[PDB]
Design a protein around this nucleic acid. Structure first.
Lengths: 101, 57, 62, 62, 171, 82
DNA sequence: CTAGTTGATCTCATATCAGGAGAAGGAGCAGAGCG
DNA sequence: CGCTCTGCTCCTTCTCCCATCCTCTCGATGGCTATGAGATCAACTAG
RNA sequence: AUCGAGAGGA
């Protein structure tokens, strides 16, 4: 399930550059690898290539809903800051439940 | 830097090349002697070496 | 071959932000170095210039 | 430096945040004051259910 | 079909109407609300018969209103597929024939009507007549039909009827 | 539940007083008839407190019991302390 | 009604260190039945 | 007489949490692949 | 405007 635009608003900066949410960047990665896997299964690809693509898709979905997986690398973004997954949006203090409800 | 006056704060750190024997209450070792070793003209991080004693029992 | 932006932008970024380390490793880097000089009164400036820091971590309750 | 004129602040139906349609944060943003968890607990102890609903539903993000 | 059913509703009331007469105001507000109304599930309500019960009026917190749940006996009209009803003809046209069944007006296309009943725009009253010209279906006539389809638009029901089935003709 | 035997307290709780006064004050503010006489009062809260002192607030308190039943008390049936 | 022209819209190509505390799993193993 | 089934202990991960509210500065953040042809369709622009 | 960091106040 890809959430609506309210959950991931594209805030406009001082100019016209529309900055997208962390969720939107992550969904972009997910759709990229999903389409890539879809074509690699549809057209010529090795079994290990499809396996690597499935592994990367798993990593993207997991880091979309939960970024602090022990051992795994954190889903990165521009400026070297990790993305804020759905879990950090409501994990504890300053999350939805404690910080907004 | 960019018109902004920036001041470097001195940062504390344990001295290097010195042997320090501590004793952690909650650990498998009774005593541990550590030495954060670093060559005179730094080229790598501090390589810490520990020489510990296993706790009795 | 010498792209001088490495040294220049690195030192400039590190002193500008305080994140002491490479700009890519912005989370392994240790912040709080290189603060904005306090210019509210002459004593504040002198003290900020004579300031020491124990990086034990404020979270620590020992 | 702490003069009252730089601290006094008030709000009555000002701007709201984009993500959650709640009052902004800060004097500079014309934001609202946080009715936090401890305030919720205090008003629960008071037994003021309509005031609690006003603060946590009707004065924040209906 | 005429029927007599008990139905439930809840209506809010402003504090101005509390007054020395209150039950009467809820009664008349219910009447002015659901008199002549229409719903696709219970069909059209011809009228409200008698108000059975007036539940306890609960003050909504934060709002001055009070909601009263009312139970009332009202008579509905629901057309059905396969039901046969007598209707009154109202308009004859080359596109079809329009007859009124109470509040609803149903249209019958020439395709559903048997082919015997011709068009006759040349006649002074637009009328349907056969080869022998024995049966005469014109405006204001009383004719039996079978209701085949129902359709609700803007909460208002409009039916469709057929004259093909045997014994369905002029009264 | 048998209205002949209501087990809850015959006193109005502080919370019942608070909510009844607020509710009746809102009703007065929304142009509801007043049950008591008025000298010059124009604040709905003052009128509601006067009605409570006079025992003339037309509200019923439905007190729910943990088992799920309830008891209906008229504001005039309860003992007003404060 | 009938073509003819003109935009939109979509599809398809070719590139390679000064935490802690608790819960759950697991493993080594002592021992008890027991076929 | 060796196998199974425990269930105890010791260690290991592993995961969760770390007062509240308020003010201010200051740095970083910006995302762009191309091009062309076939075909459908829906709207004008004449007839 | 957002995010982070830092400096502060009680």
């Amino acid at each position: 399930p890809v959430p609506p635009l309210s959950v991931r608003p594209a805030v406009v900066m001082q100019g016209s550059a529309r900055n997208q949410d962390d969720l939107t960047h992550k969904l972009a990665d997910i759709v990229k690898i999903n389409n890539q896997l879809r074509r690699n299964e549809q057209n010529g690809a090795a079994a290990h290539v499809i396996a690597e693509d499935v592994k990367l898709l798993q990593f993207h979905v997991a880091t979309m809903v939960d970024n602090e997986l022990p051992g795994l690398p954190r889903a990165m973004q521009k400026s070297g800051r990790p993305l804020k997954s759905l879990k950090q949006r409501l994990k504890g203090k300053e999350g939805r439940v404690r910080g907004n409800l | 830097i960019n018109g902004s006056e920036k001041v470097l704060i001195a940062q504390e750190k344990m001295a290097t090349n010195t042997v320090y024997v501590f004793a952690k209450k909650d650990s498998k070792y009774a005593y541990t002697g550590e030495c954060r070793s670093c060559l005179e003209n730094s080229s790598r991080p501090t390589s810490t070496i520990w020489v510990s004693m296993l706790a009795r029992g | 071959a010498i792209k001088t932006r490495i040294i220049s932008d690195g030192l400039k970024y590190s002193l500008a932000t305080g994140n002491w380390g490479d700009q890519k490793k912005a989370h392994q880097a240790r912040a709080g170095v290189s603060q904005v000089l306090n210019r509210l009164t002459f004593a504040s400036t002198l003290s900020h210039l004579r300031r020491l820091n124990s990086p034990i971590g404020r979270d620590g309750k020992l | 430096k702490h003069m009252v004129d730089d601290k006094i602040h008030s709000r009555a139906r000002g701007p709201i945040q984009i993500l959650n349609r709640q009052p902004m944060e800060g004097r500079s943003r014309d934001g609202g004051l946080r009715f936090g968890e401890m305030e919720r607990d205090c008003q629960i102890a008071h037994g003021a259910a309509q005031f609690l609903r006003e603060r946590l539903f009707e004065a924040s993000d209906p | 079909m005429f029927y007599h059913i008990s139905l439930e509703h809840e209506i809010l009331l402003h504090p101005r109407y509390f007054g020395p007469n209150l039950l009467n105001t809820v009664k008349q507000k219910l009447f002015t609300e659901v008199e002549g109304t229409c719903t696709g599930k219970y069909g059209f309500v011809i009228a409200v018969t008698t108000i059975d019960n007036i539940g306890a009026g609960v003050i909504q917190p934060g709002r001055g209103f009070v909601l009263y749940p009312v139970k009332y006996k009202a008579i509905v009209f629901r057309p059905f597929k396969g039901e046969v009803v007598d209707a009154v003809v109202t308009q004859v046209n080359k596109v079809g024939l329009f007859t009124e069944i109470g509040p609803m007006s149903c249209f019958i296309s020439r395709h559903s009507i048997p082919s015997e009943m011709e068009f006759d725009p040349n006649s002074n009253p637009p009328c349907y007549k056969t080869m022998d010209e024995d049966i005469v279906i014109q405006q204001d006539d009383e004719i039996r039909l079978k209701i085949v389809g129902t359709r609700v638009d803007k909460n208002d029901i409009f039916a469709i009827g057929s004259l093909m089935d045997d014994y369905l003709g002029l009264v | 539940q048998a209205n002949q035997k209501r087990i809850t307290t015959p006193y109005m709780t502080k919370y019942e007083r608070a909510r009844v006064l607020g509710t009746r004050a809102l009703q007065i503010a929304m142009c509801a008839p007043v049950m008591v006489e008025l000298e010059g009062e124009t604040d709905p809260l003052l009128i509601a407190m006067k009605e409570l002192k006079a025992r003339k607030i037309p509200i019923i308190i439905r007190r729910y019991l943990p088992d799920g039943s309830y008891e209906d008390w008229g504001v005039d049936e309860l003992i007003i302390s404060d």
